């Protein structure tokens, strides 16, 4: 009855109505970004090459370290998936990403479906393709992690800035403090720290706060704070600190880019929903 293309638009709707109910935008970006980010432009095959393909729904995966407290936004996201057998969670999890940038105030990304799903959690990656937010050489360790992914310097600094939504749990990845005055009272679950003050808010902020670190209650990563270290870097980041719309067309771009990693799409070209 329902085509493949409508169901996802009606799991659209049940996302946007979730969002709008539990504040959880960040985690979802988070849960796509874990699903896409283990892919190997070295590995020519699927699905060994990781990447989106709806594999991080498994415990195996859900239990590496980067993604501690993942499962809680697979949780939110199960009941929908039950309502469409056409919709995949390699899909799912790129689609509750997207719509959660574009409903935080972010860009409209450009944006295509059709992601197949692998089958057994023996399929799942190994544990490690993830950055760690405190490696020893940052700046460099973001070039050993995204460059494997195919992702260049500018992709990096831009994809970092969707830190300007959400916060971080010494509960969960242990960084960041308990609590502040930005997160006390959620919404949603309260506690964390965030990088940016209205951490529920999609705009280039991150960047300037990184950069001017006067307030105290905004956290700073290693790996946030090389990107105004490095030579490279540095270059966007500026540029993003200053021009909105810069880091708004360039993040679009990026993460439509990180959305396709190492996926396998039926069609082979995907399809679009509002194309
Ligand atoms: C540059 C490598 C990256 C490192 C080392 C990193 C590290 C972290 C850490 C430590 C947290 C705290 C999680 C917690 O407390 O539970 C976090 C949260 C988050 N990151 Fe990243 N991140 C990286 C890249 C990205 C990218 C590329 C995006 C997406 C385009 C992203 C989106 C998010 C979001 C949305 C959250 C918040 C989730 C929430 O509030 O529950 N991160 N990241
Ligand atoms: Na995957
Ligand atoms: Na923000």
Same mark, same amino acid.
């Given at each position: 009855?329902?085509?493949?293309?409508?169901?996802?638009?009606?799991?659209?709707?049940?996302?946007?109505?979730?969002?709008?109910?539990?504040?959880?935008?960040?985690?979802?970006?988070?849960?796509?970004?874990?699903?896409?980010?283990?892919?190997?432009?070295?590995?020519?095959?699927?699905?060994?090459?990781?990447?989106?393909?709806?594999?991080?729904?498994?415990?195996?995966?859900?239990?590496?370290?980067?993604?501690?407290?993942?499962?809680?936004?697979?949780?939110?996201?199960?009941?929908?998936?039950?309502?469409?057998?056409?919709?995949?969670?390699? &899909? *799912?999890?790129? =689609?509750?990403?997207?719509? +959660?940038?574009? /409903?935080?105030?972010?860009? #409209?990304?450009?944006?295509?479906?059709?992601?197949?799903?692998?089958?057994?959690?023996?399929?799942?990656?190994?544990?490690?393709?993830?950055?760690?937010?405190?490696?020893?050489?940052?700046?460099?360790?973001?070039?050993?992690?995204?460059?494997?992914?195919?992702?260049?310097?500018?992709?990096?600094?831009?994809?970092?800035?969707?830190?300007?939504?959400?916060?971080?749990?010494?509960?969960?990845?242990?960084?960041?403090?308990?609590?502040?005055?930005?997160?006390?009272?959620?919404?949603?679950?309260?506690?964390?720290?965030?990088?940016?003050?209205?951490?529920?808010?999609?705009?280039?902020?991150?960047?300037?706060?990184?950069?001017?670190?006067?307030?105290? &209650? *905004?956290?700073? =990563?290693?790996?946030?704070? +090389?990107?105004? /270290?490095?030579?490279?870097? #540095?270059?966007?980041?500026?540029?993003?600190?200053?021009?909105?719309?810069?880091?708004?067309?360039?993040?679009?771009?990026?993460?439509?880019?990180?959305?396709?990693?190492?996926?396998?799409?039926?069609?082979?070209?995907?399809?679009?929903?509002?194309?």
């Amino acid at each position: 009855a329902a085509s493949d293309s409508a169901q996802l638009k009606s799991a659209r709707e049940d996302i946007k109505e979730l969002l709008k109910t539990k504040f959880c935008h960040p985690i979802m970006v988070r849960l796509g970004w874990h699903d896409a980010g283990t892919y190997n432009k070295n590995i020519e095959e699927w699905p060994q090459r990781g990447g989106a393909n709806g594999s991080l729904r498994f415990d195996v995966e859900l239990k590496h370290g980067a993604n501690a407290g993942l499962v809680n936004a697979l949780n939110l996201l199960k009941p929908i998936k039950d309502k469409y057998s056409g919709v995949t969670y390699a &899909d *799912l999890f790129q =689609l509750a990403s997207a719509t +959660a940038i574009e /409903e935080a105030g972010g860009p #409209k990304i450009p944006m295509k479906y059709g992601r197949v799903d692998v089958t057994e959690p023996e399929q799942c990656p190994e544990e490690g393709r993830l950055p760690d937010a405190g490696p020893p050489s940052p700046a460099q360790h973001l070039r050993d992690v995204f460059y494997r992914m195919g992702l260049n310097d500018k992709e990096i600094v831009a994809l970092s800035g969707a830190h300007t939504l959400g916060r971080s749990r010494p509960d969960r990845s242990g960084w960041g403090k308990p609590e502040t005055k930005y997160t006390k009272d959620g919404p949603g679950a309260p506690g964390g720290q965030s990088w940016t003050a209205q951490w529920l808010k999609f705009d280039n902020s991150y960047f300037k706060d990184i950069k001017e670190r006067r307030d105290e &209650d *905004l956290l700073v =990563l290693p790996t946030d704070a +090389a990107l105004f /270290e490095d030579p490279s870097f #540095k270059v966007y980041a500026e540029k993003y600190a200053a021009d909105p719309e810069a880091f708004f067309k360039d993040y679009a771009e990026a993460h439509a880019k990180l959305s396709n990693l190492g996926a396998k799409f039926g069609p082979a070209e995907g399809f679009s929903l509002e194309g």
